[PDB]
Design a protein around this ligand. Structure first.
Ligand SMILES: CCOc1c(C)cc(C)cc1CNc1nnn[nH]1
Ligand SMILES: [Mn+2]
Ligand SMILES: [Mn+2]
Ligand code: NA
Ligand code: NA
Length: 300
């Protein structure tokens, strides 16, 4: 006989779809219909799943929109190279397809590059940006985390890199768990694996690290990233920066610097964390975003 009697693993959000440049994109859409929407953008190799435990904190007061990038999550998977340029084109068109006007961004990893680049080009529409573990220029390999130098150098080759990421699914099975301090459960791993069970679908997982602005290459990405970082230092847009210890892309020392150099910026320590801060302390991140959103309406 039986009797009846943690960081959430479920994804209790109804699928929403919109046609974007002839392809179907999936997104979470919850919360009130009026007011300024909060747009959550994930990076590599995740999906809207990464926001699952953060969104419920914001949804009571704001619309939350969390798309899966083209070729990822539940969005369609056209035969693209999935360059950053492709993601930009699709994300621009997604935002237009939903008829969004002003927005608040919550962005992470490659999602931050998309968010920052979009904000730079749409200064009058951005009402706030929350960000963490974001893409910035990496002048030399010495400025890349030591533990991942050899690995990412290998990733950034055609034959070896594709064998690792596409054939062996290393970014999902290897790199992903290394971006979280706590161990991911099998249920969580399965939600992350889901979009990429078919090896040929793993193209964006390989192109993304090959797009990273490292040692001047790719030059186009480096220029673009420098441009939005320059814009960011000059914009009065409200900013909220989450960081963890030791972090990965944004070490604590770097978070302290940005908190001062970026105008109108608040920085929040999430405790232990690497790249996927959302997976180590989603309640703090969600709570702080919800409260920060409230202060955006306070004049002073
Ligand atoms: C230094 C390794 O850092 C990472 C770790 C340890 C884990 C994950 C998931 C991601 C990254 C990095 N971000 C990333 N790489 N290519 N596209 N986005
Ligand atoms: Mn179509
Ligand atoms: Mn192809
Ligand atoms: Na399993
Ligand atoms: Na999934």
């Amino acid at each position: 006989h039986h009797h009846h009697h943690e960081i959430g693993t479920g994804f209790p959000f109804d699928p929403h779809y919109v046609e974007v440049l002839g392809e179907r994109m999936h997104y979470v859409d919850v919360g009130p219909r009026d007011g300024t929407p909060v747009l959550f953008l994930h990076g590599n190799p995740t999906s809207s799943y990464v926001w699952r435990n953060i969104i419920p904190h914001v949804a009571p007061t704001h619309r939350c929109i969390a798309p899966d990038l083209i070729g990822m999550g539940k969005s369609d998977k056209p035969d693209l190279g999935y360059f950053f340029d492709d993601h930009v084109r699709f994300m621009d068109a997604f935002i237009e397809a939903l008829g969004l006007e002003e927005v608040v961004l919550v962005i992470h990893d490659w999602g931050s590059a998309l968010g920052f680049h979009w904000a730079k080009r749409n200064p009058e529409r951005v009402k706030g940006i929350a960000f963490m573990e974001f893409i910035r220029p990496i002048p030399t390999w010495d400025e890349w985390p030591e533990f991942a130098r050899e690995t990412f150098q290998a990733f950034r080759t055609t034959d070896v890199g594709r064998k690792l990421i596409i054939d062996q699914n290393v970014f999902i099975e290897g790199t992903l768990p290394m971006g979280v301090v706590r161990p991911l459960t099998e249920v969580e791993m399965d939600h992350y694996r889901e979009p990429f069970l078919n090896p040929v679908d793993r193209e964006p997982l390989w192109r993304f690290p090959n797009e990273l602005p490292i040692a001047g290459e790719p030059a186009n990405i480096v220029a673009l990233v420098e441009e939005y970082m320059d814009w960011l230092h000059q914009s009065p847009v409200p900013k909220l920066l989450f960081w963890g210890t030791p972090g990965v892309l944004i070490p604590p020392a770097e978070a302290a610097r940005l908190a001062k150099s970026l105008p109108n910026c608040k920085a929040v320590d999430i405790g232990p964390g690497l790249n996927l801060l959302q997976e180590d302390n989603p309640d703090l991140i969600g709570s702080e975003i919800a409260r920060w959103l409230s202060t955006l309406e306070i004049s002073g």
